[PDB]
Amino acid sequence: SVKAQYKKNKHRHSITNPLAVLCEFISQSIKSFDRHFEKNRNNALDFVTKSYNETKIKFDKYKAEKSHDELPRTFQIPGYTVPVVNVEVSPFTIEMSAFGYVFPKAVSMPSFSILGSDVRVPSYTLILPSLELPVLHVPRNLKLSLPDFKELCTISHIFIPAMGNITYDFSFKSSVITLNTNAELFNQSDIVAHLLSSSSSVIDALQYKLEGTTRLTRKRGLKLATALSLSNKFVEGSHNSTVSLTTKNMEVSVATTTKAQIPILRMNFKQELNGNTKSKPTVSSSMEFKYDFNSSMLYSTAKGAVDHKLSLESLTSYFSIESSTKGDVKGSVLSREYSGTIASEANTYLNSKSTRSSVKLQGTSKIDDIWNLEVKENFAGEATLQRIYSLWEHSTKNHLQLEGLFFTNGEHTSKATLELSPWQMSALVQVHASQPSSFHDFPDLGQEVALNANTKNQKIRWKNEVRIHSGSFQSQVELS
Amino acid sequence: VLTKYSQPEDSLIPFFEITVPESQLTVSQFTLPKSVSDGIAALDLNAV
């Protein structure tokens, strides 16, 4: 028996949404434009008086005006009526002075009469001097102020569905299986959802319970709170997501909790996310993961934990970022122990004056007591508006082989640093930190560079040493 | 800003050094998504 009944409701809420906040907003720019206009007039002022200086002595005194005068250009447009869209166009008059060359004159245009609020007629009054008289003076005080655009500042009906209940139940009868899944949804004003699935069977794996709630309001922010829970013998899930919008501040809480029920692999993790943000945005992320491997047939097992913690501080003053994670793991494979772990720490501080970055890394892993000691994978660098410093990776490698004659191996560098400042340049590089071993005395190296520069002051030291079997060579170079 | 005739220790050539001292540029407080206004139009981000 399958149910899909649905009570149709075409009615909807029409929430009025104001737009006048936008309507005044651009209008605010207009007022600035208004004063900007008089600034333009000031620029025009810097010419107008001078232009007056070029008019009188050419027109008022010299006989060069009032010769074959013409009627001033006056163009009239009668108003019109449009009943379909109901628009009244007022008569419009355009005036140019006849004297000169189509020089603009005083223009004045009011607003028209239309239907609704779609466009705005540019009603203004600009006054400009006429060349028919020698006196030219643009009124700086008289500016041009256009009316603000009224593009439906209060007319807007956001449509919100006013719905019934979405009903869908699935029920089936048999002799070995019994499923009764019910899904319902409430849509009258807000978002209220819940799912229920009931499974009954002879087999334990086929019999379980699934349920979940989902709520989302709209009246006061979009506050969501969805939690899930699975009742199964093999999957035990508890997922918790709540997003709260209190119309002033947002909150996110993700409590993810699920565990595995596999006999040969006991995995158990955990996820928590709280993106809290009230005054300064911040991130609280810490990822948790545990696992348990055991293979009797393959005589292998693995047991470790992997975790991370993320810290973020979006502070208005500075921004410091914190991250670290651990990849710990242990195991035994064919009567041979397995090890290996990871440690991370990347500290990166930023500022408008100085920045620092140091990366600390740990990868000490061994394969059955072999090839280990990978330590000190750190490097640091600092940049200031007075000094620069860098010391990059200078790790060490010292590993042991358990097959043969206990062969030792590993080659690495020493510290090697760069120092920068006005009048002081330093390059102090010691490198070639090798490890001699068996098989005819593996070479032992080493190299030192001392560069010290203060413009003309130049100290250069270069030392090298090489060791092979039953011999050696060393060389030095010095510039003072 | 100072100007001085000097003789460097690691440079046998005398020079003239013009030095602008340290400056502390002042960056006044400002507001972020509450109500922005750049001298042209007041924009209320909270209202929108």
Side-chain angles (χ1 to χ4, degrees), chain A residues 286-312:
Chain A
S286 179
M287 295 298 102
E288 294 74 18
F289 183 77
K290 186 268 293 179
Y291 49 94
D292 184 8
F293 180 80
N294 181 23
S295 178
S296 301
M297 283 73 74
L298 301 182
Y299 305 91
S300 179
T301 179
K303 292 174 288 296
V306 184
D307 184 78
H308 168 61
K309 173 57 187 61
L310 170 59
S311 177
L312 174 57

Side-chain angles (χ1 to χ4, degrees), chain B residues 14-35:
Chain B
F15 297 110
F16 282 86
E17 301 179 358
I18 297 91
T19 307
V20 186
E22 182 66 26
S23 186
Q24 68 296 356
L25 294 174
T26 309
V27 178
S28 61
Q29 178 271 330
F30 58 95
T31 303
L32 289 185
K34 167 200 177 62
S35 183

Side-chain angles (χ1 to χ4, degrees), chain A residues 21-22 24-26 28-29 31-32 35-36 248 386 423 454-457, chain B residues 8-12 15 22 32 36 39-44 46-48:
Chain A
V21 184
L22 305 180
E24 59 86 19
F25 163 69
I26 193 62
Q28 298 297 335
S29 176
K31 87 176 177 61
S32 62
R35 78 175 178 266
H36 299 169
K248 179 56 62 181
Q386 305 287 349
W423 181 258
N454 316 87
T455 70
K456 309 302 293 185
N457 187 23
Chain B
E9 299 182 1
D10 302 335
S11 179
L12 74 165
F15 297 110
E22 182 66 26
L32 289 185
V36 295
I40 301 308
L43 176 55
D44 198 329
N46 298 334
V48 184

